[PDB]
Design a protein around this motif. Structure first.
Motif, PDB file in Angstrom:
ATOM      1  N   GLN A  89      16.754  39.802   9.095  1.00  0.00           N
ATOM      2  CA  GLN A  89      17.426  40.357   7.928  1.00  0.00           C
ATOM      3  C   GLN A  89      17.314  39.397   6.772  1.00  0.00           C
ATOM      4  N   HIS A  91      19.689  38.609   3.009  1.00  0.00           N
ATOM      5  CA  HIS A  91      20.873  38.876   2.206  1.00  0.00           C
ATOM      6  C   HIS A  91      20.936  37.855   1.087  1.00  0.00           C
ATOM      7  N   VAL A 118      16.413  35.425   7.055  1.00  0.00           N
ATOM      8  CA  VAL A 118      16.871  34.889   8.327  1.00  0.00           C
ATOM      9  C   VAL A 118      15.889  35.230   9.438  1.00  0.00           C
ATOM     10  N   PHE A 127      18.368  37.308  18.994  1.00  0.00           N
ATOM     11  CA  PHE A 127      19.118  36.586  17.993  1.00  0.00           C
ATOM     12  C   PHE A 127      20.391  35.961  18.555  1.00  0.00           C
ATOM     13  N   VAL A 139      15.956  29.625   8.305  1.00  0.00           N
ATOM     14  CA  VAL A 139      16.373  30.407   7.144  1.00  0.00           C
ATOM     15  C   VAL A 139      15.619  29.885   5.943  1.00  0.00           C
ATOM     16  N   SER A 193      23.326  24.700   9.383  1.00  0.00           N
ATOM     17  CA  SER A 193      24.160  25.706  10.040  1.00  0.00           C
ATOM     18  C   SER A 193      24.092  27.058   9.352  1.00  0.00           C
ATOM     19  N   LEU A 194      24.659  28.066  10.011  1.00  0.00           N
ATOM     20  CA  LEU A 194      25.012  29.305   9.329  1.00  0.00           C
ATOM     21  C   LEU A 194      26.019  28.955   8.240  1.00  0.00           C
ATOM     22  N   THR A 195      25.993  29.668   7.118  1.00  0.00           N
ATOM     23  CA  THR A 195      26.939  29.385   6.035  1.00  0.00           C
ATOM     24  C   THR A 195      28.135  30.327   6.016  1.00  0.00           C
ATOM     25  N   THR A 196      28.190  31.248   6.981  1.00  0.00           N
ATOM     26  CA  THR A 196      29.371  32.074   7.220  1.00  0.00           C
ATOM     27  C   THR A 196      29.804  31.889   8.667  1.00  0.00           C
ATOM     28  N   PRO A 197      31.093  32.120   8.950  1.00  0.00           N
ATOM     29  CA  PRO A 197      31.545  32.114  10.336  1.00  0.00           C
ATOM     30  C   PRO A 197      30.612  32.964  11.215  1.00  0.00           C
ATOM     31  N   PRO A 198      30.217  32.477  12.395  1.00  0.00           N
ATOM     32  CA  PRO A 198      30.814  31.349  13.119  1.00  0.00           C
ATOM     33  C   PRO A 198      30.284  29.933  12.784  1.00  0.00           C
ATOM     34  N   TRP A 205      16.806  24.730   7.918  1.00  0.00           N
ATOM     35  CA  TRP A 205      16.780  25.238   6.550  1.00  0.00           C
ATOM     36  C   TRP A 205      15.474  24.875   5.867  1.00  0.00           C
TER      37      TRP A 205
HETATM   38  O1  LIG Z   1      25.954  36.912  12.252  1.00  0.00           O
HETATM   39  C1  LIG Z   1      25.585  35.924  11.385  1.00  0.00           C
HETATM   40  C2  LIG Z   1      26.546  35.052  10.892  1.00  0.00           C
HETATM   41  C3  LIG Z   1      26.179  34.044  10.011  1.00  0.00           C
HETATM   42  C4  LIG Z   1      24.860  33.902   9.609  1.00  0.00           C
HETATM   43  O2  LIG Z   1      24.517  32.897   8.738  1.00  0.00           O
HETATM   44  C5  LIG Z   1      23.227  32.686   8.310  1.00  0.00           C
HETATM   45  S1  LIG Z   1      22.950  31.459   7.282  1.00  0.00           S
HETATM   46  C6  LIG Z   1      22.235  33.547   8.794  1.00  0.00           C
HETATM   47  C7  LIG Z   1      22.567  34.581   9.685  1.00  0.00           C
HETATM   48  C8  LIG Z   1      23.889  34.761  10.100  1.00  0.00           C
HETATM   49  C9  LIG Z   1      24.256  35.777  10.988  1.00  0.00           C
END
Ligand SMILES: Oc1ccc2oc(=S)ccc2c1
Ligand SMILES: [Zn+2]
Length: 257
Positions: A89, A91, A118, A127, A139, A193-198, A205
Motif C-alpha cells: 500500500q 499513503h 510500504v 505482511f 518504506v 519503525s512504523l510511524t503509527t501504532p503499533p 527507511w
Molecule cells: O498496520 C500498519 C501500521 C503502521 C504502519 O506504519 C508504516 S510506516 C507502514 C505500514 C504500517 C501498517
C-alpha cells in the motif's frame, strides 16, 4: 483510541505502545551534513511496471491505496536491501498548512506532506509476519512541496470525495504509482519503525532527497477528508504526522555525495 488530537496524539502513544520510546523509532530529522555517503550502497531498483492497485480506503488516520501483493508484481530491491520487498500500500501524511505535514525533516525543514510506499520482505511470507522482524519492511518516503501540480496524483485526488469518512472504501484499479516518483532516486537510509501504532521496529527507511511538487488545489483536497465516521461530528483529517524522534544509536547513510 490513538490519533492526532490533544488528548490522544503522539505524546500519548507510549502508554498503550511502550516501544514509542524505543531505540529505533521513526520518523527522524535527517541532518544532511552528518549523514555519511556509503559508496557500497546500491542503486535502488523500483520495479512498478506490473503493479495492480485494487482499492482506496479511509482508515481514520490516512487513506491507503492498496495493491495485490499475492505475487511479485510491484517490488523494491537493491539499495540497502537484501532480497525482494513487495508493495502492499501507499499513503500520505500532511498538514493543516503548507509549512508542516511531513514526518521526516531535512535539517529541521518540514515539507507539506510525505508519501510512504510500504513494502514487505517476501522471505517472511506475508505482511503480518514481516512486521515482527527487524528487516521485515522497506518504506520508500517521498516529500511533497506545494508548487506545480503532480499529474500522476490527480486520479487519487479525484476519488477522495467518495471516501470522505472513516471506513469508506472505493474501487481503485489501474493506478500507476510510477507517476508519484521524482526524477532522481538519490536517498538517505536508516533503520527505524512504523510511524503509527503499533510502532514496530521493523522498517528499513529509504527517504528520497528530491521532493515531488503538488499543487495547492491537490493538497487542499487532502484536507477535506475526515478522521470521523459518517454521521459523526466532522473532524478534518489534517496534521496526521508524527514528529521527529530521537536518533539514538543510529547512523543515517546517503546514497550520493
Ligand atoms: O498496520 C500498519 C501500521 C503502521 C504502519 O506504519 C508504516 S510506516 C507502514 C505500514 C504500517 C501498517
Ligand atoms: Zn506513513
Amino acid at each position: 483510541h490513538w490519533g492526532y488530537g490533544k488528548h490522544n496524539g503522539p505524546e500519548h502513544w507510549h502508554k498503550d505502545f511502550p516501544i514509542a520510546k524505543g531505540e529505533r523509532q521513526s520518523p527522524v530529522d535527517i541532518d544532511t551534513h552528518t549523514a555519511k555517503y556509503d559508496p557500497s550502497l546500491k542503486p535502488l531498483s523500483v520495479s512498478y511496471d506490473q503493479a495492480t492497485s485494487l482499492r482506496i480506503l479511509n482508515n481514520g488516520h490516512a487513506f491507503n491505496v492498496e495493491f495485490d501483493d499475492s505475487q511479485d508484481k510491484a517490488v523494491l530491491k537493491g539499495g540497502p536491501l537484501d532480497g525482494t520487498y513487495r508493495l502492499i500500500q501507499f499513503h500520505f501524511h500532511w498538514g493543516s498548512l503548507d509549512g508542516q505535514g511531513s514526518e521526516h525533516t531535512v535539517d529541521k525543514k518540514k515539507y507539506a506532506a510525505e508519501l510512504h510506499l510500504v513494502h514487505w520482505n517476501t522471505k517472511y511470507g506475508d505482511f503480518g509476519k514481516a512486521v515482527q522482524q527487524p528487516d521485515g519492511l522497506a518504506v520508500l518516503g517521498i516529500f511533497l512541496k506545494v508548487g506545480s501540480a503532480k499529474p500522476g496524483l490527480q486520479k487519487v485526488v479525484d476519488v477522495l470525495d467518495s471516501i470522505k469518512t472513516k471506513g469508506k472504501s472505493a474501487d481503485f484499479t489501474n493506478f500507476d504509482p510510477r507517476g508519484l516518483l521524482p526524477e532522481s532516486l538519490d536517498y538517505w537510509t536508516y533503520p527505524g519503525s512504523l510511524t503509527t501504532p503499533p510502532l514496530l521496529e521493523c522498517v528499513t527507511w529509504i527517504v528520497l532527497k528530491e521532493p515531488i511538487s503538488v499543487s495547492s488545489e491537490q493538497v487542499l483536497k487532502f484536507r477535506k477528508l475526515n478522521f470521523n465516521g459518517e454521521g459523526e461530528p466532522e473532524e478534518l483529517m489534517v496534521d496526521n504526522w508524527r514528529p521527529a524522534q530521537p536518533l539514538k544509536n543510529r547512523q543515517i547513510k546517503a546514497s550520493f555525495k
